[PDB]
Amino acid sequence: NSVIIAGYGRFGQVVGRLLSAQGYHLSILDHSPSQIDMLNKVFYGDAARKDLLEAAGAKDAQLLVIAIDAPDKALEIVELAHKHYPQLKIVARAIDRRHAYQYLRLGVTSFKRETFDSAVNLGIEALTLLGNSSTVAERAGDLFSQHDNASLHELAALW
Amino acid sequence: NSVIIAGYGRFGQVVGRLLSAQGYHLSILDHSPSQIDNKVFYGDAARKDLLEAAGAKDAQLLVIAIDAPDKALEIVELAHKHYPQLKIVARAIDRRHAYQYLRLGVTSFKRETFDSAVNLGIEALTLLGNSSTVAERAGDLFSQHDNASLHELAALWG
Numbered sequence A: 001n002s003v004i005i006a007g008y009g010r011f012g013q014v015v016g017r018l019l020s021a022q023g024y025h026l027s028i029l030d031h032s033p034s035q036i037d038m039l040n041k042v043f044y045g046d047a048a049r050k051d052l053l054e055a056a057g058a059k060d061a062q063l064l065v066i067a068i069d070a071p072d073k074a075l076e077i078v079e080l081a082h083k084h085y086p087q088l089k090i091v092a093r094a095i096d097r098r099h100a101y102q103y104l105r106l107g108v109t110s111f112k113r114e115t116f117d118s119a120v121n122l123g124i125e126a127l128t129l130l131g132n133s134s135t136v137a138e139r140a141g142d143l144f145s146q147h148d149n150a151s152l153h154e155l156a157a158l159w
Numbered sequence B: 001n002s003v004i005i006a007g008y009g010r011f012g013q014v015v016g017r018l019l020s021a022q023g024y025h026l027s028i029l030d031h032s033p034s035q036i037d038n039k040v041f042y043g044d045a046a047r048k049d050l051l052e053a054a055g056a057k058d059a060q061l062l063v064i065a066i067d068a069p070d071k072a073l074e075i076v077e078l079a080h081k082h083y084p085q086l087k088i089v090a091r092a093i094d095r096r097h098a099y100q101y102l103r104l105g106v107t108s109f110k111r112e113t114f115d116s117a118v119n120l121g122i123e124a125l126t127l128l129g130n131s132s133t134v135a136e137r138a139g140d141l142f143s144q145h146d147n148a149s150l151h152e153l154a155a156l157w158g
């Protein structure tokens, strides 16, 4: 089936790869030409242009991934998606806590802060390196995550 | 003692917090104007005098959590050259930077956007109606291989 990846930097390529593994066709949008694979559909331009999303089959796609590094444009897309393609589901890259609150305020709950999960994991590797069993090191990580994300939403919930 | 966190932006604070949860004392180094937080020194983390002040002599672990990839490697070398008893975890910006850590024998690193991207794509898969078990198994296999094959090809770096 059909997925639109807006932004194809370090973030969007990982997601792109992950999903093609299960055999989802992709339509990629990115600033600036590189070189590119057949076997996908690629348009160069501002992802926050409606004409361009429509060309990536935004009309009939199932999911839109927002994987660009510019946080204002990212929100600008979320709105166009709502305004014009309400049948489109949206996952989104959030830069930091503040950006994540803004997604929440527009009712986007499926996002991920870009450096958070790697930082948590670096800190799990840290804890093991100080001689904590991987089970306790990883349990520490989970409880830390769960709460941080929980409490991030809780406060968002009181707009 | 305990742990030296070099760089205290978004990356270093998460790690800082995680570890202080278990009660590890921290010495933080950062370039730039902070708001109040353990033991904090403002300056270039890639200065030896400054690491020494963060107790680099007697610390156990050094976390490299800064956004500048050249400085990051510059520290790794000083750590090797002068504090070989110091273990090192490190933030890598991208695949190319990860290859460079590897070339200096640093294997304990993490690409900054990688694990979040993988997870965004797991959330993607669930949203298209794949059970969280298969969605998450897809993620693992994807990771395991990517990191595996990264270590493989580090050897042909230019």
Ligand SMILES: Nc1ncnc2c1ncn2[C@@H]1O[C@H](COP(=O)(O)O)[C@@H](O)[C@H]1O
Pocket (backbone or CB within 6 Å): A006, A007, A008, A009, A010, A011, A012, A029, A030, A031, A032, A045, A046, A047, A048, A067, A068, A069, A070, A073
């Ligand atoms: N408005 C936009 N439309 C399309 N691509 C963008 C836009 N803003 C940023 N990008 C790209 O998004 C990617 C994010 O890069 P990275 O941090 O490497 O994932 C980069 O390739 C940028 O050039």
Ligand SMILES: Nc1ncnc2c1ncn2[C@@H]1O[C@H](COP(=O)(O)O)[C@@H](O)[C@H]1O
Pocket (backbone or CB within 6 Å): B006, B007, B008, B009, B010, B011, B012, B029, B030, B031, B032, B043, B044, B045, B046, B065, B066, B067, B068, B071
């Ligand atoms: N050479 C350096 N010495 C100390 N801190 C640094 C250096 N280079 C970057 N930083 C810090 O790295 C952090 C990057 O923020 P973030 O990308 O949120 O982790 C910032 O807090 C910077 O002040």
